[PDB]
Amino acid sequence: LLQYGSFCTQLKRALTGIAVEQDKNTQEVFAQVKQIYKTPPIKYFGGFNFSQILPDPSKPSKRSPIEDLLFNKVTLADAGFIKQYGDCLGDIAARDLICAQKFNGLTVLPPLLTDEMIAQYTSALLAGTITSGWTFGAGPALQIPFPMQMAYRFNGIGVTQNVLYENQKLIANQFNSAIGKIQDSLSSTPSALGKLQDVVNHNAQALNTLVKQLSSKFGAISSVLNDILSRLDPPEAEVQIDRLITGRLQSLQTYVTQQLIRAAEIRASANLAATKMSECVLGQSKRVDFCGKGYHLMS
Amino acid sequence: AYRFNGIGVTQNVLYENQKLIANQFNSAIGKIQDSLSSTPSALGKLQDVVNHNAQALNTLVKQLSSKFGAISSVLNDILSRLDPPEAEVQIDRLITGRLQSLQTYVTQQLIRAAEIRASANLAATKMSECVLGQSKRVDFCGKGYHLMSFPQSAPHGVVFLHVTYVPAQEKNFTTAPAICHDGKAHFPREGVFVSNGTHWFVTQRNFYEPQIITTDNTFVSGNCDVVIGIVNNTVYD
Amino acid sequence: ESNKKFLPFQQFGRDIADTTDAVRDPQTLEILDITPCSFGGVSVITPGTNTSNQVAVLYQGVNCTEVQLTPTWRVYSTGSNVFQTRAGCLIGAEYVNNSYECDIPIGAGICASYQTQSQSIIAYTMSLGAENSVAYSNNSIAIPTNFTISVTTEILPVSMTKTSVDCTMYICGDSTECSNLLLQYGSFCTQLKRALTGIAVEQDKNTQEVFAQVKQIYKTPPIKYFGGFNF
Numbered sequence: 001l002l003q004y005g006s007f008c009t010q011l012k013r014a015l016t017g018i019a020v021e022q023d024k025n026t027q028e029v030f031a032q033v034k035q036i037y038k039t040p041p042i043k044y045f046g047g048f049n050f051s052q053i054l055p056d057p058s059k060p061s062k063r064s065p066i067e068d069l070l071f072n073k074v075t076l077a078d079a080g081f082i083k084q085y086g087d088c089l090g091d092i093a094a095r096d097l098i099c100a101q102k103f104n105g106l107t108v109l110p111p112l113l114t115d116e117m118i119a120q121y122t123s124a125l126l127a128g129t130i131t132s133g134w135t136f137g138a139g140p141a142l143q144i145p146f147p148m149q150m151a152y153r154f155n156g157i158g159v160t161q162n163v164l165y166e167n168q169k170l171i172a173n174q175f176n177s178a179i180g181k182i183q184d185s186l187s188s189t190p191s192a193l194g195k196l197q198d199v200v201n202h203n204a205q206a207l208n209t210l211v212k213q214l215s216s217k218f219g220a221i222s223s224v225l226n227d228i229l230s231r232l233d234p235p236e237a238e239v240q241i242d243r244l245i246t247g248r249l250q251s252l253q254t255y256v257t258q259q260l261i262r263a264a265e266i267r268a269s270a271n272l273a274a275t276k277m278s279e280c281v282l283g284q285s286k287r288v289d290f291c292g293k294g295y296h297l298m299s
Numbered sequence: 300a301y302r303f304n305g306i307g308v309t310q311n312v313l314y315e316n317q318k319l320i321a322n323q324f325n326s327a328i329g330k331i332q333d334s335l336s337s338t339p340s341a342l343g344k345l346q347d348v349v350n351h352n353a354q355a356l357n358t359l360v361k362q363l364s365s366k367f368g369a370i371s372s373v374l375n376d377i378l379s380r381l382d383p384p385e386a387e388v389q390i391d392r393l394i395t396g397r398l399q400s401l402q403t404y405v406t407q408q409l410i411r412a413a414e415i416r417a418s419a420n421l422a423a424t425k426m427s428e429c430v431l432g433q434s435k436r437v438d439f440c441g442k443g444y445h446l447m448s449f450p451q452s453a454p455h456g457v458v459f460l461h462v463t464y465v466p467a468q469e470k471n472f473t474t475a476p477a478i479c480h481d482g483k484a485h486f487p488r489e490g491v492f493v494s495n496g497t498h499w500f501v502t503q504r505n506f507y508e509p510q511i512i513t514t515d516n517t518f519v520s521g522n523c524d525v526v527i528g529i530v531n532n533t534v535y536d
Numbered sequence: 537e538s539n540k541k542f543l544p545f546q547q548f549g550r551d552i553a554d555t556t557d558a559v560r561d562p563q564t565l566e567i568l569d570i571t572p573c574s575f576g577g578v579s580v581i582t583p584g585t586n587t588s589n590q591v592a593v594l595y596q597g598v599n600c601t602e603v604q605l606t607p608t609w610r611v612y613s614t615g616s617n618v619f620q621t622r623a624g625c626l627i628g629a630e631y632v633n634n635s636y637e638c639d640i641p642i643g644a645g646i647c648a649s650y651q652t653q654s655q656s657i658i659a660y661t662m663s664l665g666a667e668n669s670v671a672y673s674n675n676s677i678a679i680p681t682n683f684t685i686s687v688t689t690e691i692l693p694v695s696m697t698k699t700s701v702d703c704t705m706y707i708c709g710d711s712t713e714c715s716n717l718l719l720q721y722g723s724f725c726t727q728l729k730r731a732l733t734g735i736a737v738e739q740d741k742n743t744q745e746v747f748a749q750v751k752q753i754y755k756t757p758p759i760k761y762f763g764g765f766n767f
């Protein structure tokens with residue numbers, strides 16, 4: 001194999017580039033603000049109930065109930081943790097695909113940012129947008145009562161403030177009911193989070209196909225190198241080894257190309273998500289159907 | 300002044316602070332050259348394209364010295380050392396390897412071209428929306444409230460200079476949603492009610508400029524028994 | 537030792553990749569399981585060679601207690617240089633208790649840097665940002681009293697280099713037999729030329745679309761006075 005050029009250096013370079021791009025995507029999406037704001041100890045906002053989205057201090061992970069439901073809904077195969085060689089050597093007579101992948105040179109790297117840091121970023125964004133409105137996205141954060149912010153948003157969509165000030169209780173009750181229905185809607189629907197599951201399914205399928213490809217003959221007498229070496233005369237074994245080498249190189253190149261295309265698509269999706277976070281959360285948008293259906297208020 | 304009116308500030312704010320604004324703009328422009336020169340890795344995105352192209356071409360050239368399972372990497376040696384019907388089995392290996400290298404190079408170039416096209420589309424949209432007009436999209440033409448932008452050309456790319464307005468030196472105040480007077484509720488037309496401790500004024504949004512509360516800058520449109528947190532005072536005519 | 541229940545007529549055991557993992561001893565009818573010997577990947581963390589020649593080593597996916605090795609060199613562990621992260625085992629760096637901005641990424645929230653403390657290599661947990669807390673009240677507001685004009689820069693790539701390739705010169709050079717042999721391999725080179733030409737045209741299209749918004753060439757007035765603004 002040493003005399004077939006530098007294909008493997010190119011493969012390693014492409015994989016490293018994809019790995020770096022993933023962390024860049026996450027950082028660009030989730031690190032808009034550099035200040036960690038905290039919610040006030042007293043939770044009164046004019047009758048608006050935000051308990052379903054604020055972090056829950058009782059549980060160790062400090063996640064909101066909706067985030068807990070979301071994390072329980074999606075099933076993950078490998079998290080990049082230490083799938084230690086000690087775990088694979090345990091020989092529990094139940095051989096999973098992870099050990100087979102690991103025994104053939106295929107590994108998974110952990111992301112730079114943990115889930116706790118992402119939760120902290122989300123909590124900071126929520127606290128800022130609840131206590132300051134849209135001021136903290138353009139400079140220093142300025143305090144303001146929540147109903148006044150809501151009236152300002154109604155003025156933004158083209159309705160006078162007395163409409164809000166004379167219907168505060170009804171609006172608060174409607175918002176509370178709408179928030180309450182979200183958890184039931186998410187739980188009842190079985191295929192709500194299909195987009196997130198598709199990525200995991202695609203990655204697992206690609207790795208399994210790559211592992212399964214090792215049992216092909218590619219026109220040789222056997223798919224095992226040791227059998228060829230032990231059964232054949234040394235100058236005659238190269239013509240059989242070359243076929244296997246070429247087939248495996250072709251499989252690796254196909255895998256790398258597919259990974260590159262999928263990475264480009266994921267990068268486009270991440271850019272869209274970052275734009276949505278900048279425009280619908282840190283401000284009020286007038287673009288039609290960009291931050292929901294209807295007249296946008298907040299997100 | 301028209302741009303300040305666009306971001307939500309009255310014109311007299313500019314007309315009474317023309318010299319200060321001009322000096323601030325001049326200093327901000329002057330600092331740009333020093334900031335660009337001092338930073339060594341400011342223009343990394345533009346250098347990455349050149350580095351990638353050079354590396355790809357160098358790899359393609361270096362690939363010509365591989366044997367691909369043949370007896371030599373030079374065609375002349377094979378032709379001069381081997382019997383003519385036996386030389387094809389050696390030439391074919393080299394041909395196939397070089398074809399594979401070319402195909403790999405072409406695929407990589409296509410993917411990079413797609414990425415560059417996406418970047419160029421974004422740059423064209425930014426040029427249309429931030430330079431030829433004033434944008435209200437948050438964080439699209441800089442950080443802060445957008446005023447205007449200037450383009451400059453660079454090797455294989457463009458540079459945008461965004462000018463933005465940032466508030467500073469804030470102060471606390473006491474506020475109320477409405478003012479009660481003669482059994483009637485008054486709401487501000489534009490701005491917010493503010494109290495310094497004894498009196499009540501009405502001010503605008505992003506700049507502190509108190510005014511006497513009057514029927515000229517308020518509308519009544521209601522009664523004084525349903526608004527929560529109302530404060531009663533006097534309204535002049 | 538093997539816990540598998542081989543049938544009396546079976547002699548071998550295979551896995552998904554179709555390689556042997558269970559065997560039966562020819563002399564004593566006993567089942568044995570075969571596992572690969574320990575292995576892993578190694579990464580090197582260093583500052584620039586212009587700064588120092590010190591390095592740190594990261595063994596990926598390896599528990600710190602399981603470290604004739606394939607690499608001849610060995611980095612020997614002292615009392616304090618060994619650290620365990622969810623990304624592997626780190627040797628040659630000291631874990632400090634402070635937090636800074638990330639300098640060299642390592643793993644799950646762990647970064648490394650070169651610090652003067654005697655200069656050394658330290659490892660830490662990255663800091664998200666400065667702590668803050670805004671006071672919230674339902675009868676209080678904050679209003680700015682001054683402003684600042686700021687100027688920022690943004691860099692965007694537009695186009696890249698346009699290249700062309702000659703198949704016959706690259707693959708066969710001046711040989712005629714090679715060209716005759718290549719002539720019967722189809723029309724791959726026509727496709728290659730078409731793709732390269734398309735990319736070359738697209739580059740010029742990108743530049744034209746970016747830089748040709750207006751069709752009138754305006755000129756600045758000879759007198760440069762704009763109310764005190766210096767351009």
Ligand SMILES: *[C@@H]1O[C@H](CO)[C@@H](O[C@@H]2O[C@H](CO)[C@@H](O)[C@H](O)[C@H]2NC(C)=O)[C@H](O)[C@H]1NC(C)=O
Nearest residue numbers: 043044045047048049050051052065176179180
């Ligand atoms: C905000 O909503 C939550 C959930 O609807 C309320 O929590 C409920 O409180 C009642 C009375 O204390 C309990 O019987 C329920 O079991 C709680 N539900 C959950 C899911 O914990 C909460 O009280 C609301 N906020 C306020 C201020 O009333």
Ligand SMILES: *[C@@H]1O[C@H](CO)[C@@H](O[C@@H]2O[C@H](CO)[C@@H](O)[C@H](O)[C@H]2NC(C)=O)[C@H](O)[C@H]1NC(C)=O
Nearest residue numbers: 493494495496497498499500501509510511512
């Ligand atoms: C709040 O603002 C009002 C309006 O300017 C202040 O009242 C003035 O105070 C000055 C200073 O003594 C007097 O010369 C003026 O005659 C007052 N105005 C009127 C209409 O009488 C008031 O002092 C301010 N309060 C605080 C705490 O600064």
Ligand SMILES: *[C@@H]1O[C@H](CO)[C@@H](O[C@@H]2O[C@H](CO)[C@@H](O)[C@H](O)[C@H]2NC(C)=O)[C@H](O)[C@H]1NC(C)=O
Nearest residue numbers: 318319320321322323326467468681682683684
């Ligand atoms: C708003 O900020 C500007 C700039 O920070 C202030 O202008 C400065 O004022 C001080 C005090 O007179 C001078 O010593 C500086 O030379 C000024 N700077 C410039 C660039 O002119 C301005 O005073 C502030 N506004 C208020 C009302 O205090």
Ligand SMILES: *[C@@H]1O[C@H](CO)[C@@H](O[C@@H]2O[C@H](CO)[C@@H](O)[C@H](O)[C@H]2NC(C)=O)[C@H](O)[C@H]1NC(C)=O
Nearest residue numbers: 325326328329330332760761762764765766767
């Ligand atoms: C606009 O700014 C430039 C640069 O800050 C000014 O040019 C300077 O002018 C002074 C006095 O003529 C010279 O001593 C400097 O050497 C010049 N700097 C450079 C870089 O050439 C220019 O004068 C300013 N415009 C006006 C109208 O004053």
Ligand SMILES: *[C@@H]1O[C@H](CO)[C@@H](O)[C@H](O)[C@H]1NC(C)=O
Nearest residue numbers: 468469470471472670671678
């Ligand atoms: C406003 O008051 C709060 C609480 O007293 C304080 O934290 C804040 O610094 C004050 N704002 C200014 C601009 O002084």
Ligand SMILES: *[C@@H]1O[C@H](CO)[C@@H](O)[C@H](O)[C@H]1NC(C)=O
Nearest residue numbers: 479481482523529530531532
């Ligand atoms: C004005 O407000 C005060 C304080 O709440 C209240 O005692 C008084 O009754 C109000 N005036 C009228 C005419 O209701």
Ligand SMILES: *[C@@H]1O[C@H](CO)[C@@H](O)[C@H](O)[C@H]1NC(C)=O
Nearest residue numbers: 560561562563564565566567
């Ligand atoms: C093979 O020979 C050895 C030594 O003579 C003996 O211990 C063993 O049981 C034999 N095995 C069989 C299968 O005959």
Ligand SMILES: *[C@@H]1O[C@H](CO)[C@@H](O)[C@H](O)[C@H]1NC(C)=O
Nearest residue numbers: 082084086087599600601602
């Ligand atoms: C590493 O080995 C020690 C030794 O007993 C063990 O306690 C620890 O759980 C191991 N760590 C992992 C991640 O397997």
Ligand SMILES: *[C@@H]1O[C@H](CO)[C@@H](O)[C@H](O)[C@H]1NC(C)=O
Nearest residue numbers: 616630631632633634635661
């Ligand atoms: C690091 O700081 C934490 C903060 O309380 C402390 O509990 C811990 O003991 C410190 N560790 C060392 C090694 O000093």
Ligand SMILES: *[C@@H]1O[C@H](CO)[C@@H](O)[C@H](O)[C@H]1NC(C)=O
Nearest residue numbers: 042044045046672673674675
């Ligand atoms: C908000 O208003 C309520 C009135 O129900 C009051 O009890 C509370 O103290 C107010 N918030 C603050 C921060 O004073």
